[PDB]
Amino acid sequence: KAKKMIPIDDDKLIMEFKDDATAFDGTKKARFKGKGWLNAQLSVIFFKLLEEHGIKTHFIGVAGGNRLIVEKLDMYPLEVVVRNVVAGSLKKRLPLPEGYELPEPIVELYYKNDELHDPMINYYHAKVLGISLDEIKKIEEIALKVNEILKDYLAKKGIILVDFKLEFGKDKNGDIVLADEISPDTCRFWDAKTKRSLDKDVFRFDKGDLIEAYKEIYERITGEKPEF
Amino acid sequence: KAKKMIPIDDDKLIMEFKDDATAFDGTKKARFKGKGWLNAQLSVIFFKLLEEHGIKTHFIGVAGGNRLIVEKLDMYPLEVVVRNVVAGSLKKRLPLPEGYELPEPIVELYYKNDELHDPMINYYHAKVLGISLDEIKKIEEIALKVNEILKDYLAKKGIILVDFKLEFGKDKNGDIVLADEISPDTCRFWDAKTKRSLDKDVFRFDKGDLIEAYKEIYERITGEKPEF
């Protein structure tokens, strides 16, 4: 939908970020010149920050442009959502308004399954899917640590980390490794002062120019204007 | 919808079982002569079996007919579903067929909220709702024990306990107490040999005569035909 995965050997693969965007279960589509580049660069920056804080990620290197070199993993069929501020689907699960500051972070597990439209699950469903409690607990422990690091880092830069989605896999040592991407596609980012979205919500709800929003994020994080 | 609650003092209340049935989020409605009586009697039998196995319930006594006398509790806004065999909404959450035997029981938490149509939640949502992890763990521990007792008891009688819903509240000692009802309205019961529903699914999917189905359950459990 927004990324290509190209095998290299029985060891690593290429993650290519595309300019395509989709929302509302693939029903809304557009293309954004340079979105691939931005998401790639921002993933790189985030993976490197996390690695420095002792988070095992799949990031190996950059292969020029929109391509990252990443470790091949046996992927868990999960999307792991961490939420700090009420937004999106959480409003349908808790009678709390958009912008409501949660007393502590919420972690939600979604089963990656297109036929079922990625339904929420709990630890018991996970076990039936072959994911032990020990594994789930390790997964949530990492997500919550990732949350702390990202939110602290973004707060210093005037960005509120509202919520975000992670994915994980297992390496050949049986270690749990952070995978996929971390980008304005997979996080909610709000300007600390104005509360305005600097993320995919801009595309989702026609809140303005997506590229402009993603550029702003890139500039606020790196300190420089995007080269492309 | 199917029950009346009438206060007595600051201590106990009357639970009245009505002949009304509703399904599909209240959209389907009918009335069944004697359904109140059956559900009341079956709740009584189930609460008494559970009490004997050391499960704290709200059951105090019978007030003649369709009325039970029950302890007043500070109710948790939860519906606690335990599942042994795949049926109902679980088919939309896991790609497994109706009748699939789960490797271990699944416990699901639903937030009792009409405005939101009782959405599934996890332990984190529960905490935001004011339910501690300790409380949730105690709740699930009871549900799972209730499951064992009910399924063992029903298995001896040629009935498979497919799934069921429980509700809980807190007593004045801060103890977690099983509440609401246990009946063919709130459980799936399948005949062990034929796999046929002897529960509300008969009304839900026009599988035959609901009263006949509930009578069969009552006769198979008590050993005698229902008096009314």
Ligand SMILES: Nc1ncnc2c1ncn2[C@@H]1O[C@H](COP(=O)(O)OP(=O)(O)O)[C@@H](O)[C@H]1O
């Ligand atoms: N390190 C990795 N090893 C193996 N597969 C991965 C890795 N990182 C991401 N993937 C997978 O590559 C696929 C490409 O992702 P995509 O179809 O764009 O959707 P999404 O990644 O958002 O689920 C996904 O199924 C994702 O789980």
Ligand SMILES: Nc1ncnc2c1ncn2[C@@H]1O[C@H](COP(=O)(O)OP(=O)(O)O)[C@@H](O)[C@H]1O
């Ligand atoms: N021991 C109890 N103390 C206080 N309230 C109770 C007790 N048992 C059940 N209730 C509540 O009484 C109400 C009547 O139930 P009803 O409207 O028929 O729907 P349901 O019980 O299926 O949620 C419910 O909100 C239920 O939680």
Ligand SMILES: O=c1ccn([C@@H]2O[C@H](COP(=O)(O)OP(=O)(O)O)[C@@H](O)[C@H]2O)c(=O)[nH]1
């Ligand atoms: O398939 C998905 C669903 C959600 N998210 C992200 O996870 C967070 C939580 O999203 P939510 O549950 O609110 O769903 P949404 O409203 O985004 O559809 C948001 O930052 C989304 O951008 C994602 O990256 N991929």
Ligand SMILES: O=c1ccn([C@@H]2O[C@H](COP(=O)(O)OP(=O)(O)O)[C@@H](O)[C@H]2O)c(=O)[nH]1
């Ligand atoms: O509001 C509800 C929803 C479910 N159940 C019971 O809980 C079990 C699980 O139901 P499920 O999640 O499959 O929903 P359903 O298919 O019954 O709507 C079944 O025994 C239902 O009878 C209930 O008593 N009240």
